[PDB]
A paper describes a structure:
The hepatitis C virus (HCV) glycoprotein E2 is the major target of neutralizing antibodies and is therefore highly relevant for vaccine design. Its structure features a central immunoglobulin (Ig)-like β-sandwich that contributes to the binding site for the cellular receptor CD81. We generated and characterized anti-E2 MAb DAO5, which specifically recognizes a linear epitope comprising part of the CD81 binding loop and the E strand of the central β-sandwich within HCV E2. We show that a synthetic peptide corresponding to a β-strand of this Ig-like domain forms an α-helix in complex with the anti-E2 antibody DAO5, demonstrating an inside-out flip of hydrophobic residues and a secondary structure change in the composite CD81 binding site.
We expressed a Fab and a single-chain Fv (scFv) fragment of MAb DAO5 in Drosophila melanogaster S2 cells. Diffraction-quality crystals of these antibody fragments were obtained in complex with peptides spanning E2 residues 529 to 540 of strains J4 (genotype 1b) and JFH-1 (genotype 2a). Superposition of peptide residues 532 to 540 from Fab-J4 and scFv-J4 peptide complexes confirmed an identical peptide conformation with a root mean square deviation (RMSD) of 0.136 Å, calculated over the backbone atoms, which together with the unrelated crystal packing interfaces for the Fab and scFv complexes indicated that our crystal structures reflected the genuine conformation of the polypeptide chain recognized by MAb DAO5. Unexpectedly, the peptide forms one α-helical turn comprising residues 535 to 539 (DVM/FLL), in stark contrast to the extended conformation observed in the cE2 structure. A detailed comparison of peptide residues 532 to 540 with the corresponding segment in the cE2 structure revealed that the short α-helix observed in complex with DAO5 folds as strand E of the β-sandwich in cE2. The distance spanned by residues 532 to 540 is considerably shorter in the peptide structure than in cE2 (20.6 Å and 11.6 Å, respectively). In the context of E2, this difference between the two conformations can likely be accommodated, because this segment is encompassed at either side by the putatively flexible C′-E and E-F loops. In the presence of nAb AR3C, the side chains of F537 and L539 are oriented toward the hydrophobic core of the β-sandwich (red side chains in Fig. 2E), whereas both residues are buried to more than 80% in the DAO5 binding interface, indicating that they need to be solvent exposed to allow interaction with DAO5. Of note, in the absence of a stabilizing neutralizing Fab fragment bound at this surface, the side chain of F537 is also solvent exposed.
Residue numbers in the entry:
A (entry chain H): 1 to 133, 140 to 220
B (entry chain A): 532 to 540
C (entry chain L): 0 to 213
Write the structure that this text describes.
């Protein structure tokens, strides 16, 4: 089976250079052009450029001229994209794709994506704050000041799964904030305890925060 | 058809 | 000029079993050189149709494409639960290769005003010298919404962190979290903390507030 395997998530500093890889298996690497695509918030897809592995011919989107450089390593059937002078604008998920299949070709096989986060941050555990205040009551947990992603949240160790909203984390001033809400009947709180469990594997953190009335 | 030379041939 | 692909409407709301058509319009004639992709979360784009109408091995028969020149259409002949997500068109007739901005295929439901809850800073955060005020704007539909923070009746935009959920897998609604962060010193210089939610469900914003000194 045709497989495009990309290198792992990257946590890089502003101004750095980074090279990310797209390693193929199951077919002849030099058969088809490779393409790189940037997935940014929206979601939004942008085409960066293409390289013809058989001869090194390229075509670039002018928007990425200088920023991104394409290459191939035929000895290892691996396509590479190199970024220079990284900024927060370059934080995105990058995909490689081949332009093959039955004739006429199209972007038929894709890599799994490579997440790139450009930040000056160091691994930092989260602070977990309680969110305490109808027929229903909403409680929550505010997860701030941590790095990197991911942080995962459960309520009562997964026993409270209905009426939960866990929001995507957002990076602001080189630290993340995440929040999670839970809605329970007003009659059940504070009599039935509500606790968020916050896991941050990067910092070896797993903490509980019980929500109590103000 | 400026892309065929690169993408299809 | 780069070929501009316009996908309009940006959001199509349907129910499983409906027949749907998605539009991709080109700024200049591109013959049959349009391809369609499905895209979910941060996963790889998936090729559905190539060269406006050509089928792809393994793609279910319910997906078809038609059109030529500048007017293209992707059709789903009876929408299945697995089909909700983003649909992007792409042109390969001219350099640079370009994508449309995408159409979100979402689950249709009845409009719902957000359930708004506001929370003062926790004593734990205050002890650390910080003050975050959180508003959850939960289970609303449709997705567009605006939040404004007012401190002592004055709009505040500094220190606001917003996050939005994808469409809820259980009830087809959307949620939003908004966190306003101040220092403890700045938080104590004011009394009223308000978050105003503007949504299509009412001509009046939902106004949730608290007074610090209460």
């Amino acid at each position: 089976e045709v497989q495009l395997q990309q290198s792992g998530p990257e946590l890089v500093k502003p101004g750095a250079s980074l090279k990310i890889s797209c390693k193929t298996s199951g077919y002849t690497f030099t058969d088809f052009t490779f393409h790189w695509v940037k997935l940014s918030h929206g979601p939004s897809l942008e085409w960066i450029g293409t390289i013809k592995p058989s001869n090194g011919d390229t075509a670039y989107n002018q928007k990425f001229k200088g920023k991104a450089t394409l290459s191939v390593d035929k000895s290892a059937s691996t396509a590479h994209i190199e970024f220079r002078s990284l900024t927060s604008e370059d934080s995105a998920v990058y995909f490689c794709a081949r332009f093959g299949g039955s004739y006429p070709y199209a972007m038929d096989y894709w890599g799994q994506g490579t997440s790139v986060i450009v930040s000056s941050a160091k691994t930092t555990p989260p602070s977990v704050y309680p969110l305490a205040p109808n027929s229903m009551v909403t409680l929550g947990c505010l997860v701030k000041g941590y790095f990197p992603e991911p942080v995962t949240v459960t309520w009562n160790s997964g026993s409270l799964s209905s009426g939960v909203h866990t929001f995507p984390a957002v990076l602001q001033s080189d630290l993340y904030t995440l929040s999670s809400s839970v809605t329970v009947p007003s009659s059940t709180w504070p009599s039935e305890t509500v606790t968020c469990n916050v896991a941050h594997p990067a910092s070896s953190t797993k903490v509980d925060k019980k929500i109590v009335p103000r | 058809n400026e892309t065929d030379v690169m993408l299809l041939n | 000029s780069d070929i501009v692909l316009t996908q309009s409407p940006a959001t199509l709301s349907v129910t499983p079993g409906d027949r749907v058509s998605l539009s991709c319009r080109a700024s200049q004639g591109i013959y049959n050189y349009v391809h369609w992709f499905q895209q979910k979360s941060h996963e790889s784009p998936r090729l559905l149709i190539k060269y406006a109408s050509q089928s792809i091995s393994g793609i279910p028969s319910r997906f078809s494409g038609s059109g030529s020149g500048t007017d293209f259409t992707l059709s789903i002949n009876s929408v299945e639960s697995e089909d909700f997500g983003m649909y992007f068109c792409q042109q390969t007739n001219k350099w640079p290769l370009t994508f449309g901005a995408g159409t979100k295929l979402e689950l249709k439901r009845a409009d719902a005003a957000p359930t708004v809850s506001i929370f003062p800073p926790s004593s734990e955060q205050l002890t650390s010298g910080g003050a975050s005020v959180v508003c959850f704007l939960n289970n609303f539909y449709p997705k567009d919404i605006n939040v404004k923070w007012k401190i002592d009746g004055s709009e505040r935009q500094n220190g606001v962190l917003n996050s939005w959920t994808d469409q809820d897998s259980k009830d087809s609604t959307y949620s939003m979290s908004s966190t306003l962060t101040l220092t403890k010193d700045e938080y104590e210089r004011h009394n009223s903390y308000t978050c105003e939610a503007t949504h299509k469900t009412s001509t009046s914003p939902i106004v949730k507030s608290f007074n610090r000194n209460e």
